[PDB]
Amino acid sequence: GRYRRCIPGMFRAYCYMD
């Protein structure tokens, strides 16, 4: 939504807009 999140990936950092 109105926030930026970052989760651990297998190849690279996977961020999104929660």
Cα radius of gyration (the chain): 8
Q: Give the number of C-alpha atoms closer than 13 A to the C-alpha of residue 8, restricted to the C-beta side.
A: 0
Residue 3 and residue 18 in contact, taking contact as beta carbons nearer than 8 Å: yes
Q: Report the relative pairing of strands 14-17 and 4-7 from DSSP bridges.
A: antiparallel
Which residues contact residue 13 at a Cβ distance below 8 angstroms, ignoring those fewer than 6 apart? 6, 7
Residue 8 and residue 16 in contact, taking contact as beta carbons nearer than 8 Å: no
- Structure tokens of 9? 């990936």
Residue 6 and residue 18 in contact, taking contact as beta carbons nearer than 8 Å: no
Largest CA distance in the chain: 26
As a residue count, the chain comes to 18
Dihedrals phi, psi of 17, to nearest 5 degrees: -105, 95
The separation between CA 14 and the C-alpha centre of its own chain, rounded to angstroms, equals 4
Helices then strands, each counted (H, E), the chain:
0, 2
